[PDB]
Amino acid sequence: MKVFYDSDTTFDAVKDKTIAVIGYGSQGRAQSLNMKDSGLKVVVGLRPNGASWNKAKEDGHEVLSIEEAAEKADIIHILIPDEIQGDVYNKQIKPYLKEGKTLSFSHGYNIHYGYIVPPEGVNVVMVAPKSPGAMVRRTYEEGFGVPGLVCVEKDATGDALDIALGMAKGVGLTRAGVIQTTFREETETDLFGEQAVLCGGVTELIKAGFETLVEAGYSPEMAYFETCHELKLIIDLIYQKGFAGMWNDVSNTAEYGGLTRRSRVINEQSRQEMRKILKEIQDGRFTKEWALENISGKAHLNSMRRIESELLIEEVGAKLRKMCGLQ
Amino acid sequence: MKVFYDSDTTFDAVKDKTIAVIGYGSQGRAQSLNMKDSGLKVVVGLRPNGASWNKAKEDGHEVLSIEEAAEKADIIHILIPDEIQGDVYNKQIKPYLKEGKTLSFSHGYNIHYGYIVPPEGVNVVMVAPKSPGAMVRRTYEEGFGVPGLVCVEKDATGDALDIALGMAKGVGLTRAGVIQTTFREETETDLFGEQAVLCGGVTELIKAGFETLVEAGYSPEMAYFETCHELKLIIDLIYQKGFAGMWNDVSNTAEYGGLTRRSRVINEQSRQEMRKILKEIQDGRFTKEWALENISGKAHLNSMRRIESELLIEEVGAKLRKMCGLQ
Amino acid sequence: MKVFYDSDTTFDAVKDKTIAVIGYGSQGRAQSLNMKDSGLKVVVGLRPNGASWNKAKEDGHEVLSIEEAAEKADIIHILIPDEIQGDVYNKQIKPYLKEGKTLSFSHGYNIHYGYIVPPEGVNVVMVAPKSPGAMVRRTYEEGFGVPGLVCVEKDATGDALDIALGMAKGVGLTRAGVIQTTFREETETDLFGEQAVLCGGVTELIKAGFETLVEAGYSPEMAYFETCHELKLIIDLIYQKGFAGMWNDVSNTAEYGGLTRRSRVINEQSRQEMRKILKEIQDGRFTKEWALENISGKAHLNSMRRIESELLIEEVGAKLRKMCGLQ
Amino acid sequence: MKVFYDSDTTFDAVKDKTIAVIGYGSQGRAQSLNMKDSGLKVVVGLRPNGASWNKAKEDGHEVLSIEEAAEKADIIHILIPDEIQGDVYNKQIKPYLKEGKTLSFSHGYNIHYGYIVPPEGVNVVMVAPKSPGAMVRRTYEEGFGVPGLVCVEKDATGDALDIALGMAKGVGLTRAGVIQTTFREETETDLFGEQAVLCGGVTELIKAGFETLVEAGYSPEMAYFETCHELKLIIDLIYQKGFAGMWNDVSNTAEYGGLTRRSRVINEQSRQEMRKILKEIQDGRFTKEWALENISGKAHLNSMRRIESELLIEEVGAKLRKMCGLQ
Amino acid sequence: MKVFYDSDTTFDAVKDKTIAVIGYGSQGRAQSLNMKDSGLKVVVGLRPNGASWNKAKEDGHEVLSIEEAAEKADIIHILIPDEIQGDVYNKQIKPYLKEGKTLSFSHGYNIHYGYIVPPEGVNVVMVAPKSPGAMVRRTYEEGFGVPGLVCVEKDATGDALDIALGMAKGVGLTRAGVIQTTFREETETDLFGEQAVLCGGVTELIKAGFETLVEAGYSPEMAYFETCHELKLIIDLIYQKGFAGMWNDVSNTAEYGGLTRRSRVINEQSRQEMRKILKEIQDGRFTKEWALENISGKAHLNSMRRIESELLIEEVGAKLRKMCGLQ
């Protein structure tokens, strides 16, 4: 689509403005340091009774309380988990807002589903890198950056897009290219990807192939190699050269085998269920389910975690990664 | 069934009693004004920090706080949304109750599902008009009223039915006729009607017919007319003259067409699902689901709302209603 | 689509022309009186041995025989039931036609399905109000009118559209807005609407909900209220404010209930059968079936009528409408 | 498996230690009195504003507040309903814990699903009798006891198992035999048993047989006898002599009938659903559902209760039990 | 239904009459001793070449041969297994019958299915206790009795009902209450109960739950506890307090779990098969099958017995009952 680069953006809208980064996780740290290193005026609002409070001080940030940071700053960038953003916002951020300020996120989940409703006269933007905090910071240290996303949900003051592009210019996303999408599009495609393919899809795929080999009498070690370990090789090829580049870089036996058997693994039933997974995200049923999970104490989620940790594929991968020196 | 009219009821049980109407929505306003205009002693309990507080004052009501009204009155009529009645009751009403008082509703949802448990020695009645507040008030201004429902859930003091009929006599329902049913029967049939036919049923019916025409290449404007706009004509005929009166008032081509094709639209599957919808209401699963919807932040409900507002039938109806001068 | 209003139309093509309205039903009477009252020269052709003959005289119309009217007039407007139009046309209208005359209808059923084939040099137009005769006349008495449809099936003389818009200008449809569609589009969408939703669809929906409650032990009176009587309230809201306006004007419990249960009542099977109902209308199978119904003596239709009149919902609605004073 | 008896256990680990029994239900009372009567130092922590507070005093226990008891004791035995343990623990128990103390339960539901997370340095054990409080106390009064379960979830201090066996020795379970299992195994099999067979399974079985007879025209009284009342006879035989002992103690006609028809009642579908019921317990979905039931006000649960009380089998059993003198 | 008690019955019809009890099983012994102890004149007819012959003598009964007893007595009470009653009757009882005598049973299986056809002028009655012989005798020793059933199949002489009530008065059933049903109703409901629920139903239920746990890796000992051993607790509660009393006496987690999962174990397929099991009893197909089982040497029945004794649930229950001291 339309891309913004360095030549296409300036720091005019962020120049004389104080930016509060709420949160010091991987994205909290990487984005805060980059913008500070880009010349932007940054304060980091955290909980006094927290671990990241002391780490953010070790890095030389003006560390404040979340209320203290919300009050001082014109731009509040919220990088905390979606499942507690709403509660932290309505208690410790919303009261310290005023006409002219800007609300910024790296994820549109809370805005899109109504868990955070901004006050009148407040901009709502998104500055979303498409790489983990570690890479965000690392590429920025090297004079390059990582591809990112930018969005405008509410343009109260008029320079919402420029504020978001200014923040993206300071984080370094602009060096690699920034794409303008919508809060709804970022949210829905992000939830669908993680659920249907990125996290859910592939782990069930790897489980099924591994369990097929193991139940057929094949060595668990060999099964882990051909259904899990080796997969990184193929993805890296697709990541760099695309599908056609991958097929050319693998053996013709592997190419023919993949092209003739793959429609049998992802059947029509899988595709019909992918449509329901998307509709459950669209109409808010998944958000409801995820919210009630936290409200009910995450018992379902913690049981699944224990079951996942008891998998044979886990125990075999640990031994193999131990031998390799990967783990 | 058995009907109560004006000749069948008196104000003996409500005469020297103070009635608190909690809430000033369509029913809050219409019912409060009618009873006051009928000679009954009315106070209106509201939130001081609310909009209806000032409107209720503009109409000349003794406006009080919900606690203030609960304390003063012998009869507390609660006309606020079911999904917050329980919380408002257990905090600001229950403490100001005493033996001899009466708890009154226009909807039995909260009593029936245990979200409001009355104290010992307190009457639980229902005064439920079967028309919207606007009509309730309007018909009463004209010397007539609107058909209503009356119920007794707990007869602590002995004049529970008379208190409810006295309130119905002051609201004006008695002029058109009042029917005595049960809190469970009002609740279950109300939930089933709105879900299976009144709101859910017909909108899905209108959507399907409209989407059938549009997907077949028919003009969206013409599709809106023959699947939505015209429907009011038929309902008004059924409302006034019943089914047989409607069929006689439409063309024989429309009559034959309707009588021979309609069993094909509401199939056996629709009727089997109507039975499950009823059982989900009966056994409290819907109430649980609706309660968790509010507890989880109404994300599912707000997503559905946005999707409903993005429908083609909405955009076409707006243009047609704009031309007509209806909207 | 494109709308014609008063400022967009004139009486130039109907000015010095005699218009015969064949039929004095609800539309016959309303349309004839309006055009006469608008200044147009109207004669009403009827059967001498008929009831409407004397009523049309009481209203001051030049009442003629159908042949007499067909001969005198340049424009013949046929407002009699579709199932006898063809026979009345080929015997008492077609012979008195000449090049330059215009054939006009409010319904394109007979033209579209070949039951009326016009002679060469004769215009075929449609002047179709989208409201019942009573409203057509009433709104016209009040300086406003009712939304209508206009169509040109054959433009022999050149002013077919102007003749139809002139008639629509005299009936008063032009004050509310007139839409130009086709004889096929009016016919097919009209038949589909009445069959799938307007008459067939909703009555089967109301039957199923009512029969569900009654078979579950609920009071027939209460079942009629929540599956029939109350429905008028919702439709009137959709009629005036559309879907979104209705949902906002009902309780959140009714809104959530409707949005989550309605897809279960109109299932995929209902939508597949709606497509067949449309194809049966498109390819003329329904017209064949309706024609053979009349030819065979309407035994099937009269049996269905008797069965409809024996329904429990009829007997309960009559008692409730009797109490209300509606019937 | 491996059983612990009296000869296998001592009071060494509980000797100079104060044991707080939180709760005075059937198990609270029976277990507290037994351990006190066995020589152990017991205090009973309860709510001051509660009924059991006064009953526990009538029995001569040192009655304390839950916080008071948590502070004084080294061993805190929590015998309150699982659905409020977590809230009572995190507020009134967790703060008064210290390294060296022990957390004890008769049910592992809250520990296993993460609703109670113990502090570092605190033992987590289970002392679970396999009989109701009434029998626990009664058998102990008679020099015998009731079979029990023992578990160690966290062995911080080293004598966790001995502390649990010491408590089991004081409750009297050791006289009948104590089995060491795991918190997960006790929880999952307990939930599965109550749901699939012990409470859910058999009541649906009794309902189906009773409803089969009644719908076939058989006397409800006779149906209750042959589908409910008589069942106690068979269970008591299985309880004492096992399956083979039961079959030998019934008529050959009843034996042949049971052995040839029973596979037809519990079909493959029942067994497939038993596997899903177990997986829903394993992965925490049932715990989530039960938690949300309480959070949402137990509307679903209270509706089911009312429906259960309206069953014909209830009304007929009451009359028969009334005649018998059982009720 | 209608109950007979002590105040409602006398010994007038049995006073000067000799009662032969054929058989000295649990019911043979208990019923014979009770009637003798009640003042009735009893002789016990048995096989000379049998074990019970000597036991019946040890108890002080006038012990006779079956023919000797049939000849002496006016009332012949047959308490031997249904599958040999017919052969013993037609050879050693029928010839010693005369007009005026009475044929009595505790089970109507043989009369109802035509295996015993009485001679003209002979009464056919039923005296059926609803408890095992051990309890019949024990309760009678304690001044109370056990609930019973009474039936009249043929009233030849006129005092058939009185003879049966007199026998029930001597057995002691009248102290607890006696119900009058029919030979067909006792038989069919007895066969259905034992097959669908009492013996067949519950053992297959217990097998499925136990096998579910065991196949999932749960300890067989723990599986026996939660699918078999504990069940006695629930039944005893239903036996004494009914369903509602049981649910109130179990944990809310067990109650919610049971009410929401139980419809999944007894599915529609189970209920359809219960109807076939009943029809097979009604139309005599089961009786035919049971008769051919004995005629063919009980090979099928003895194989099933061996298979039942080889079950894992048997071996685990034996070890657990051994530890408990139950077995």
Ligand SMILES: [Cl-]
């Ligand atoms: Cl760094």
Ligand SMILES: [Cl-]
């Ligand atoms: Cl190649």
Ligand SMILES: [Cl-]
């Ligand atoms: Cl699909």
Ligand SMILES: [Cl-]
């Ligand atoms: Cl007013």
Ligand SMILES: [Cl-]
């Ligand atoms: Cl007709």
Ligand SMILES: [Cl-]
């Ligand atoms: Cl069904």
Ligand SMILES: [Cl-]
């Ligand atoms: Cl007029």
Ligand SMILES: [Cl-]
């Ligand atoms: Cl809202």
Ligand SMILES: [Cl-]
């Ligand atoms: Cl199709």
Ligand SMILES: [Cl-]
């Ligand atoms: Cl005691």
Ligand SMILES: [Cl-]
């Ligand atoms: Cl045998």
Ligand SMILES: [Cl-]
């Ligand atoms: Cl399976």
Ligand SMILES: [Cl-]
């Ligand atoms: Cl004895």
Ligand SMILES: [Cl-]
């Ligand atoms: Cl409760």
Ligand SMILES: [Cl-]
């Ligand atoms: Cl069937």
